[PDB]
Design a protein around this ligand. Structure first.
Ligand SMILES: *[C@@H]1O[C@H](CO)[C@@H](O[C@@H]2O[C@H](CO)[C@@H](O)[C@H](O)[C@H]2NC(C)=O)[C@H](O)[C@H]1NC(C)=O
Ligand SMILES: *[C@@H]1O[C@H](CO)[C@@H](O[C@@H]2O[C@H](CO)[C@@H](O)[C@H](O)[C@H]2NC(C)=O)[C@H](O)[C@H]1NC(C)=O
Ligand SMILES: *[C@@H]1O[C@H](CO)[C@@H](O[C@@H]2O[C@H](CO)[C@@H](O)[C@H](O)[C@H]2NC(C)=O)[C@H](O)[C@H]1NC(C)=O
Ligand SMILES: *[C@@H]1O[C@H](CO)[C@@H](O[C@@H]2O[C@H](CO)[C@@H](O)[C@H](O)[C@H]2NC(C)=O)[C@H](O)[C@H]1NC(C)=O
Ligand SMILES: *[C@@H]1O[C@H](CO)[C@@H](O)[C@H](O)[C@H]1NC(C)=O
Ligand SMILES: *[C@@H]1O[C@H](CO)[C@@H](O)[C@H](O)[C@H]1NC(C)=O
Lengths: 85, 333, 228
């Protein structure tokens, strides 16, 4: 169906996902912030020359609390924040 | 137990109503755009489900980790923290809940290659399922990060930077927050730890037992399945026509009245689709309201200590623990 | 006071820059208007549908058809358009329901953040709520939440209790911290060390039931100087 939709050739590798088959985007192992949500944790964005790339979403920045059996952290400063809603 | 999201579905009117019939496509074209509203509504519903999941679960900007040593003032959280000895980094209680909920799900299958039989056979009838944006191992990672933050930092990580604190010290200050002096904990720590361990084990026994209390999550799945089954069975309705098959109508009838015969069939099936869409939107609204309540409960019981009566459990609230469930969430108060 | 006023002024100016910026975050108010306009437009456009009839014009269908079948042709068009109106009304009610829910939430938030101070976490802004300000918007309302966010933390040494004379001492409304050699008492939300005296602690029990007690001294502010 839609015979005109040849979608050129396999210039960009076809990436197979659980949602389906995506043609026209190149998979990368780098994790970036989501731009266009494809689904199942995969998002696509326009970046660097310039092309459309597909990747795996990152939950957030890693952290590790320095826990100890005698230790506490107390602030020495404060910040006043104004937010909209 | 609180529902969070539901299944994302898409329906193709042209193929569902008139499967492989060009004459039907030309005749449906005279009705204008009778399918954009349904497609737009379904896309909005799917986006709403994804947004609901993101608001409920994505509340921390950092992925905290627990120290390798699992000694917290004598308390044992080994039955709720994930273990790396499984492909799914899930707690034993999480595994029990998923095993209990999995009698029916969407199938887990979305490649469509292995379909040679309820979903993919309905796939030939324009009922597909879109995958959730967050997989269960990312929802699990979110829950594990939230649990780690709560055990280590307490309520400090929910309003800025995570601040470390000994676990007995956080319990003593939390007790002081409800009108009980901290010497009570410092003198009955062993008894309190024993009671907590026994209570957790009884939680495991309660869930592992037969009287499944997870009816709220099962009701949504059952309703969706039954609605889809009714819609697919509705294709057999005659709607006043001599027959329910378009090919048969074209072969056995001349155009002059075949036009109205199919117009009647189109009207009946379009009415069925609009009714189904209305039912889906109403259920989407109730599920979204439930999601909003769940979000309020997470933010007010998990991220802090609540003074509201009978809001986070029954009695005098101390803390709550989140666990992930299929299209839902489970709290331990 | 001066620093806090400067921070508040800077935060308000940044709020102006955020709103005046091109990436408008006011999509919630625009979504409702867009949805209503699109629904109304499709309702208007639905008039041109033939509904399977011979023609969509009443005058043409009346002049070019006999009454025996013109009646049912008009009845078909009437039924189709009535179905369209009932549908439109249904989505109008569902949207009104959602609007009412949002309005109820907004009213509760205004009454609980603007008219008072809220202890509910992540309800009136993000952080520790101080006050909120309402602003009027077309078919909506905008809140400006002022919160308190700690910063510049420092590590210390801490104890649950301090043993002085075979007695356990506990803080009144503070924590026990130590910069090393010495021990001080400070509030738990801001660093303000103080000497641990009998007016900063209360005595309960002995020095063999609390895990982690530390030997130290508690100063008596009455006997040494007012010994006359
Ligand atoms: C928090 O830290 C900031 C930056 O170190 C302090 O701001 C400085 O304050 C001093 C005196 O008030 C000024 O001379 C500097 O010009 C300020 N610099 C900046 C970058 O703001 C602030 O006073 C601290 N707040 C506390 C300790 O409560
Ligand atoms: C907390 O106490 C339990 C006692 O049952 C310790 O043993 C765990 O028991 C559960 C339930 O049978 C098992 O699923 C775990 O595998 C057991 N843990 C281990 C290490 O064998 C548990 O270890 C204790 N947790 C602590 C001390 O953190
Ligand atoms: C913690 O800070 C206090 C205050 O600076 C230190 O207490 C001593 O206080 C006397 C009284 O003025 C000073 O003459 C000493 O110089 C202070 N000691 C030091 C090392 O500065 C206390 O010693 C500090 N504790 C540490 C650094 O472990
Ligand atoms: C505070 O001083 C007492 C002084 O007795 C310490 O008590 C220890 O234990 C018994 C007495 O209960 C005796 O052996 C000694 O008097 C002490 N030393 C040892 C090695 O036992 C007590 O341990 C001190 N507290 C802290 C936190 O050091
Ligand atoms: C606290 O002390 C206990 C005592 O053995 C130890 O098991 C645990 O690892 C310690 N926790 C720390 C140092 O964070
Ligand atoms: C305490 O030291 C640890 C060292 O890993 C650091 O991560 C933490 O930020 C420090 N907390 C302070 C300085 O309040």
């Amino acid at each position: 169906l839609t015979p005109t939709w040849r979608v050129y050739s396999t210039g960009s590798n076809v990436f197979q996902t659980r949602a389906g088959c995506l043609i026209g985007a190149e998979y990368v192992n780098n994790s970036y912030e989501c731009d266009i949500p494809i689904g199942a944790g995969i998002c696509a964005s326009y970046q660097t020359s310039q092309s459309i790339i597909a990747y795996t979403m990152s939950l957030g920045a890693e952290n590790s609390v320095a826990y100890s059996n005698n230790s506490i952290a107390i602030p020495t400063n404060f910040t006043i924040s104004v937010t909209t809603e | 137990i609180l529902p969070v999201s539901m299944t994302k579905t898409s329906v193709d009117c042209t193929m569902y109503i008139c499967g492989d019939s060009t004459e039907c496509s030309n005749l449906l074209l005279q009705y204008g755009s009778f399918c954009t509203q349904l497609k737009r509504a379904l896309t909005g519903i799917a986006v709403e489900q994804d947004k609901n999941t993101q608001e409920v679960f994505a509340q921390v900007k950092q992925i905290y980790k627990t120290p390798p040593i699992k000694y917290f003032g004598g308390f044992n959280f080994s039955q709720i923290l994930p273990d790396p000895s499984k492909p799914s980094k899930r707690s034993p209680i999480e595994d029990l809940l998923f095993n209990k909920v999995t009698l029916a799900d969407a199938g887990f299958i979305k490649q469509y290659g292995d379909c040679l039989d309820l979903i993919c056979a309905q796939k030939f009838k324009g009922l597909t399922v879109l995958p959730p944006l967050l997989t269960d191992e990312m929802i699990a990672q979110y829950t594990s990060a939230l649990l780690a933050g709560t055990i280590t930092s307490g309520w400090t990580f929910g309003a800025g930077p995570a601040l470390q604190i000994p676990f007995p010290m956080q319990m003593a200050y939390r007790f002081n927050g409800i009108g009980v002096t901290q010497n009570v904990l410092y003198e009955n720590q062993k008894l309190i730890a024993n009671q907590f361990n026994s209570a957790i084990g009884k939680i495991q026994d309660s869930l592992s037992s037969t009287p499944s209390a997870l009816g709220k999550l099962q009701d949504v799945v059952n309703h969706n399945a039954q609605a889809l089954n009714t819609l697919v069975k509705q294709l057999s309705s005659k709607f006043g026509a001599i027959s329910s098959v378009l090919n048969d109508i074209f072969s056995r009838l001349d155009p002059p009245e075949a036009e109205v015969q199919i117009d009647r069939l189109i009207t009946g099936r379009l009415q069925s689709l609009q009714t189904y869409v209305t039912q889906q939107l109403i259920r989407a609204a109730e599920i979204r309201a439930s999601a909003n309540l769940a979000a309020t409960k997470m933010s007010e019981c998990v991220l802090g200590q609540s003074k509201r009566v009978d809001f986070c459990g029954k009695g005098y609230h101390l803390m709550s623990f989140p666990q992930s469930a299929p299209h839902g969430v489970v709290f331990l108060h | 006071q001066k620093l806090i006023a400067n921070q508040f002024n800077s935060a308000i100016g940044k709020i102006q820059d955020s709103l005046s910026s091109t990436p408008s975050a006011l999509g919630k108010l625009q979504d409702v208007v867009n949805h209503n306009a699109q629904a109304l437009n499709t309702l208007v456009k639905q008039l041109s549908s033939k509904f399977g009839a011979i023609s969509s014009v009443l005058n043409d269908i009346f002049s070019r058809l006999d009454p025996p079948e013109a009646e049912v042709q008009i009845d078909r068009l009437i039924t189709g358009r009535l179905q369209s109106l009932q549908t439109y009304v249904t989505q109008q009610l569902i949207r009104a329901a959602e609007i009412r829910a949002s309005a109820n939430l907004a009213a509760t938030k205004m009454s609980e953040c603007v008219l008072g101070q809220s202890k509910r976490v992540d309800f009136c802004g993000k952080g520790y709520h101080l006050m909120s300000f309402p602003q009027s918007a077309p078919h909506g309302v905008v809140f400006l939440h002022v919160t308190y966010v700690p910063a510049q933390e420092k590590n210390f040494t801490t104890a649950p209790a301090i043993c002085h004379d075979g007695k356990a001492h506990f803080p009144r409304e503070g924590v026990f911290v130590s910069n090393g050699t010495h021990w001080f008492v400070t509030q738990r939300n801001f660093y303000e060390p103080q000497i641990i005296t009998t007016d900063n602690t209360f005595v309960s029990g002995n020095c063999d039931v609390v895990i982690g007690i530390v030997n130290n001294t508690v100063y008596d502010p009455l006997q040494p100087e007012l010994d006359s």
